[PDB]
Amino acid sequence: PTHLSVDTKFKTEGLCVDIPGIPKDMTYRRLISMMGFKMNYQVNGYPNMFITREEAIRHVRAWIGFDVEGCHGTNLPLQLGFSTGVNLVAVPTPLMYKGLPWNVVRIKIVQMLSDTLKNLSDRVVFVLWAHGFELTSMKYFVKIGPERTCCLCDRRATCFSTASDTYACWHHSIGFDYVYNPFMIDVQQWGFTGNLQSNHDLYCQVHGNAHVASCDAIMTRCLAVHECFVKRVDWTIEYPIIGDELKINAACRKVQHMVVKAALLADKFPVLHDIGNPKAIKCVPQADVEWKFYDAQPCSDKAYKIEELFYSYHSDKFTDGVCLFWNCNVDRYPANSIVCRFDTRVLSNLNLPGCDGGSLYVNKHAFHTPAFDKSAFVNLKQLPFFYYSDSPCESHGIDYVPLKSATCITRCNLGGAVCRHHANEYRLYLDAYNMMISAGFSLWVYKQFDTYNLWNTFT
Ligand SMILES: CC(=O)Nc1ccc(Oc2ncccn2)cc1
Ligand SMILES: [Zn+2]
Ligand SMILES: [Zn+2]
Ligand SMILES: [Zn+2]
């Protein structure tokens, strides 16, 4: 059972207001035919337009919410809404566009999907709360057939052009007019009571209902993200590399070792409380400190309440030494903390919009992250950039312009002239640091943290 069988039953009750008289007994096979598409008994990689919840989860980067509303069928204008916030009006003669015939609407659809998805996925997954008009509008902008490759590259085809009779991926589809072999999933098939707004509003206050198709499209995709990544979490699913994943993860480890190593040297805490991932390793293995670990998996719904993580009876005295929260999201960090908190508002190809202000950060695995909250950091301050090193000043082994920086905390800089080795390492560290920050990570530290305390470790 890799794919969804076309002979699987589809509950049609949600469809009967737009499609009155629709049979109760319905399969995907019959529904696809009713949508005006012909499958022709084809064993060519596209067995069904519809996919399973498990196939949808593996392809979350392709999710595009889609809703169609009657503007007043046949000669009835339709408002096509997408979770990108776009509303297009198709005539059969929060951005709102005036009514235009399908021949030009389809060009806009292909441009919009290609720009949204080219750096995210090899396909499109239309996320629906199906009532009828969305399924019946598909024939006007969608073509299907065997799985194909792009005319200009090796990627799978996502678009077709009637002008040239050719196929293209999201990167080479300029001027293309048809969406080719898209996928779709109907959230109503999952078993819900009541309408879309009543199910969406149970878990989210950020998306409102301005009574337009894009609002419904956004709510549908949000509800799907909540069901698949908030109330149900699967960290075994692997996602492909689409950007700077490897560099970001390597930078995260480098910055963690740097910041924790310097905090221990500058303030000499006798104990460190490491709160978070149950598979955590000591990030500063040579430190003298009593290292104590506390298990907490990544919170995907609301940030952990500090009172539940720490109280209800471990050193028990979390107030002793320092607390390390490396991507362990809490409502209010204690004053004696070293913190790395992912900022959900960051715009990137790894960060997808999520539920109730949260975001879906997809880097090797998918992590729904609760909304970034500035009040969580009131007992702390932003951690400034700095580079520290106690390693010998020795080159061993890329040209050189002399480094001058007040934040290069090394013996050579204390001595008045940064050596080549420490200048190379500083610049590499700065690149890693900027990579991590730009990926959305934010760093916070206890107010007494002062890098001036690091210079005296060079005696
Ligand atoms: C072993 C491991 O990978 N641990 C882990 C993963 C994700 C974590 O939350 C998170 N949230 C947003 C951005 C990044 N990370 C926390 C810890
Ligand atoms: Zn291509
Ligand atoms: Zn929402
Ligand atoms: Zn040096």
Curated annotation (Swiss-Prot):
It is found in: Host cytoplasm; Host endoplasmic reticulum. S-adenosyl-L-methionine binds at residues 274-280. Inhibited by Remdesivir antiviral drug (GS-5734). It comes from the Viruses. Zn(2+) 15 binds at residues 200, 204, 207, 222. Zn(2+) 14 binds at residues 150, 153, 169, 172. The active site is at residues 67, 69, 134, 211, 216. Mg(2+) 2 binds at residues 69, 211, 216. Residues 355-369 are annotated as: GpppA-binding. It catalyses: a 5'-end (5'-triphosphoguanosine)-ribonucleoside in mRNA + S-adenosyl-L-methionine = a 5'-end (N(7)-methyl 5'-triphosphoguanosine)-ribonucleoside in mRNA + S-adenosyl-L-homocysteine. Residues 239-459 form the N7-MTase domain. Mg(2+) 1 binds at residues 67, 134. Zn(2+) 16 binds at residues 393, 412, 419, 422. Residues 49-230 form the ExoN domain. Interacts (via N-terminus) with DDX1. Interacts with nsp10. Plays a role in viral RNA synthesis through two distinct activities. The N7-guanine methyltransferase activity plays a role in the formation of the cap structure GpppA-RNA. The proofreading exoribonuclease reduces the sensitivity of the virus to RNA mutagens during replication. This activity acts on both ssRNA and dsRNA in a 3'-5' direction. This is Guanine-N7 methyltransferase nsp14. It comes from Severe acute respiratory syndrome coronavirus 2.
